């Protein structure tokens with residue numbers, strides 16, 4: 474087995490060994506809650522529009538004929554600031570140290586890009602608000618977030634300047650496929666991965682969650698999350714996480730806030746001062762633009 478013990482300390486020693494060259498991060502809403510971006514799937518965080526069923530506001534067919542409810546929600550959920558968390562900057566340190574193979578994110582908040590991850594390092598599995606596109610097949614004019622934000626706050630349904638068709642944020646609506654990029658990167662990246670770092674996701678959304686089963690059998694998998702996640706469901710179960718059985722050999726659960734877990738791991742790696750300096754610098758820069 475590649476980990477000398479099933480602890481954060483064991484993962485840190487593995488990461489500092491010659492065996493650990495290529496890290497894949499799988500991240501969800503839990504890496505952005507400390508940035509003041511609620512998880513839209515969280516129960517703790519629209520009747521006038523007459524939605525056939527609640528989830529119709531995120532369904533492609535309904536949105537194309539009735540986009541008003543979605544854009545009204547977009548203005549209400551629009552964050553007041555885009556300040557990446559310690560977890561986001563930890564992934565930037567992975568990139569800087571030549572350890573980041575890829576970051577697969579289920580988030581659409583663009584914090585990975587703001588923290589310094591480039592398009593090549595990223596797989597936005599559920600799409601993103603970073604870019605928007607006219608929905609007309611013969612046009613597909615691309616619009617930046619600055620353009621889409623103005624339309625969202627003005628309460629003007631965004632229309633293409635070339636053909637007057639609806640302009641849709643590049644998020645994956647229900648009824649749309651995950652991007653081709655997701656499947657092609659998964660097919661290549663999971664041949665090469667030395668460590669799977671799973672942070673701030675309950676691994677309940679498919680097919681994203683199934684990525685953990687694409688890791689080679691030897692590849693250590695560290696979960697940094699408020700709750701244990703990724704174990705086979707005893708009912709549905711009739712390559713899940715095994716943290717706590719006598720057969721456990723490679724899966725580690727660090728239970729707490731993603732920021733606290735990434736700080737703890739950075740500290741073990743001798744990166745704590747580097748991470749503090751990077752976060753304080755970027756936070757200062759963002760605060761001065763805000």
Ligand SMILES: Cc1cc(C)nc(SCC(=O)Nc2cccc(COc3ccc(NC(=O)c4cnn(C)c4)c(I)c3)c2)n1
Pocket residue numbers: 510511513531543546547548550551552581582583599600602603618644645646647648649650651678679680
């Ligand atoms: C407006 C804005 C801009 C920026 C840059 N950040 C933010 S962060 C705050 C926020 O949550 N905003 C927000 C607003 C309106 C709607 C939504 C809903 O977003 C999404 C996204 C993807 C998905 N897709 C999946 O999950 C998924 C999976 N399989 N399939 C097939 C789809 C869904 I469903 C909903 C979010 N907000």
Ligand SMILES: [Zn+2]
Pocket residue numbers: 607608609612613614633634635636637638
């Ligand atoms: Zn157009």
